[PDB]
Structure 1
């Protein structure tokens, strides 16, 4: 029944936990299936079937405890985090029963068109809901470590979003010194440099997502960790000297004179100063009411995209920003 890799071979029409009748797909190789709960008047549910093996089962149980913690902390469901209904085992696989949702934000952008992006009013509502998710994430001692359009789901009417996929989530007391934490394009500079990180990494990831939600394009589509720093410095300039010294992977990107080494058949180029060339306003941009809102988003992105997490806009200040309050 289980694959060599550890995946479960799902069947359309199969009944899970003697109640969940699987009727459709959402995404296969953990496999997420759409089911109807026969015990609860055929109500729609999403069942996440976690991969077997050894390492995947550990992350599944880790996902279970984090979702339970966030759900108990938010009884009224006003902090936009995915709702776990219950859990069961099926043919050695841990199965998580979730609230049913329509599509992820990556899927909605594809339906919006090639580099079209969402309407400024939708981006405004989505940002507030994402900032509310960060508030609950910070209230609990949880780091999502994978905020991106693929991991944010929306309801049928596309009015309510939910932060999903807590498979790569971690506790704040846990400080794993890894430069590969968070999907590369949404990876904060403090992860890459090897600096002590906190809730700011999730804030950075939200900023990358908010630019992508309006433009339909990835903010920093870097090939490697070094290219990610170059693209981040192409907007805000060179990283502050006090931040570079605090890191662990200092030597891998910066020399003894604190100058950045850009990689382009190896090709290494020494850079003393990086001038801010990337124009957010030009890349983001019709009516005066909408134009004023794009300018407010631009100022909010400037405050989120600060290289030093200590200079980064807080969750409360992001919620109170002119772009949200109108």
Structure 2
């Protein structure tokens, strides 16, 4: 005990007395997050309620990954865990997990709405690449980066909110069910950057199939060598489609979208387009690496024991998560 309940959205948060003035913030698509005052720390914090951690295998794996990686990862561009708790006293009774994190000011959705500047943008992308690089060195490949799981303070420091997969920003190979590697996450960063420039989602598929049409309408049909890596049913569909030439990157991202009328501006316009052209590459074999995008002229101005293999039963996930909850 020392718990009380407050209604938040359609659910009930039960939290430690220390966390006061619970207020719903951002998208709740991946669990409800509240802003709160922590009276013990005397600071504001964010509290996420995990959404039905034991509804199934998928939810439980995802709950385990998120909690474990959030305890174990420590990096300036990755959200910090402050606390973890459950209102329930025993394993039998155990159903809810709460993560308390440092509070940021907004997600990238709100920053994309505002006008574009080069210095801000390259700083946001730099930090995105630092976070992603740090994840990759730890063996973590995300796969589901998007503006609403990236958060920012008013000073423009950026943190990645989550750890992704145990849709508009998804790499071609992920969507098409082929192998994936590190640079899967480069595709998502290209989508976000392009959207910072267009202020429009680049690839708005009104379904999972139309999505693909939107990609190659703008970028063009990939080479036959890309299509040879697809499973039979997917290759069939992909290669027997009207061939698209796509648009060049200057057409995809016109002069009117960028600051103009200074040598500096026209330079940064080209450096941004150039970067865009190496991130938004359908074939992962041809797409720039994280190390390379960080060394890119647009960005480099800023240079200075846990099961992922196995399936488990819900009860074994419950115990694995619970002990993770109880041991700090």
Match of 1:254 among 211, 229, 236: 236
Give, in whole Å, the separation in 2 of the partners of 1:54 and 1:321: 44
Instruction: Calculate the aligned-residue CA RMSD, in Å.
Output: 2.5
Match of 1:181 in 2: none
Partners of 2:224 and 2:239 within 8 A in 1: no
Match of 1:47 in 2: 47
Match of 1:280 among 230, 234, 252: 252
2:237 is equivalent to residue 239 of structure 1: no
1:142 aligns to what SS in structure 2? coil
Partners of 2:227 and 2:235 within 8 A in 1: no
Match of 2:177 in 1: 194
1:143 aligns to what SS in structure 2? coil
Match of 2:186 in 1: 203
Displacement, 1:58?
Answer: 4.3
Partners of 1:8 and 1:93 within 8 A in 2: no
Partners of 1:234 and 1:274 within 8 A in 2: yes
Match of 1:306 among 274, 277, 281: 281
TM, length-normalised to structure 2: 0.77
Q: Which is worse superposed, 136-145 or 94-103?
A: 136-145
**Runs of 4+ in structure 1 over 6 Å off:** none
Give the count of matched residue pairs. 279
Give, in whole Å, the separation in 2 of the partners of 1:58 and 1:8: 22
2:157 is equivalent to residue 160 of structure 1: yes
Match of 2:304 in 1: none
Displacement, 1:61?
Answer: 2.3
Give the number of the structure with larger relative contact order, counting CA–CA contacts within 8 Å between residues 6 or more apart.
Answer: 2
Give, in whole Å, the separation in 1 of the partners of 2:253 and 2:25: 36
TM, length-normalised to structure 1: 0.78
2:107 is equivalent to residue 109 of structure 1: no
Distance verdict in 2 for CA 1:241–1:291, change over 3 Å: same
Give, in whole Å, the separation in 1 of the partners of 2:245 and 2:47: 49
Give, in whole Å, the separation in 2 of the partners of 1:235 and 1:203: 18
Structure 2, unaligned runs of 5 or more: 89-94, 302-328
Structure 1, unaligned runs of 5 or more: 171-183, 262-270
Give, in whole Å, the separation in 2 of the partners of 1:165 and 1:138: 14
Give, in whole Å, the separation in 2 of the partners of 1:188 and 1:163: 18
